[PDB]
Amino acid sequence: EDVYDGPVQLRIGNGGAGQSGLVKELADAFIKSKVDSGFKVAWYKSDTTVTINYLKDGIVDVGITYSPVAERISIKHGISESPSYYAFRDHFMLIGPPSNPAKLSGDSDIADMFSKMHDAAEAGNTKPPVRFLSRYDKSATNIKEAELWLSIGQVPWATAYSTWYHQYITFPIQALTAAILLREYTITDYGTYLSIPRGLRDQMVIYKKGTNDADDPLLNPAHLLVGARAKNAEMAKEFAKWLVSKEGGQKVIEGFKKDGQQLYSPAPYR
């Protein structure tokens, strides 16, 4: 999808971070420190499932993923080296229209917010009606909201199909833009939010933003996986080590900005 120059000696499979520009900064910083001391870095666009599939078929050397369980299983299969590397922390957010037809209260737990939206959507007698936008595309965001609905015992997509469960299958920015224009609630991410026009942000309200607390459902941890059969093995090991060092990777992440805001939080202290 794009190669950075600071011979290809490092292939990374990822979705959101490359799409946000972080993979560029990271790669240019790594190439920098290896040459600045004693090559190009190619980025392959892929969701977590594919990234792991690539590591398995040796298409990429490393992969930044967003699923601790999938990561653990990839390692159990010998697809990935043990252990995984905590790279950075992204955050999901529940946003909705200023009219707040679901009457969500900022202090409520995210699960109770979902319970409230469901009942209000089922009542269908609000102005505007309560609707929830799902990217319905197997992405980390889709997994997240699907997870949240199930957490309160609901399956909106299953028969006796919940018509207020709105399938708008597109990339992050378009989906958030659509939710705002249509006056619907939706789970989105911090980076996508900072990507839309300021004007649109005034046509929506942030009802819940993920924190860095380890058990916050809206926390979106990113880990790096080193392929077991990976080509350029020693460099994948080099990148992995560099990425988590306060000196390299963590410094670049702590300073990576978008719309004048730090996009991601550094990995937890270790």
Footprint on this chain of Ca ion (rule: CB under 5 A): 139-141
Half-sphere exposure in the Cβ direction for 7 (13 Å, CA): 4
CA-angle at 105, arms to 99 and 199, nearest 5° = 40
Distance CA 84, CA 226 (A): 7
3-state secondary structure the chain: CEEECCCEEEEEEECHHHHHCHHHHHHHHHHHHHHCCCCEEEEEECCHHHHHHHHHCCCCCEEEECCHHHHHHHHHCCCECCCCEEEEEEEEEEEECCCCCCCCCCCCCHHHHHHHHHHHHHHCCCCCCCCEEECCCCCHHHHHHHHHHHHCCCCCCCCCCCCCEEECCCCHHHHHHHHHHCCCEEEEEHHHHCCCCHHHHCCCEEEEECCCCCCCCCEEEEEEEEECCCCCHHHHHHHHHHHHCCCCHHHHHHCCEECCEECCEECCCC
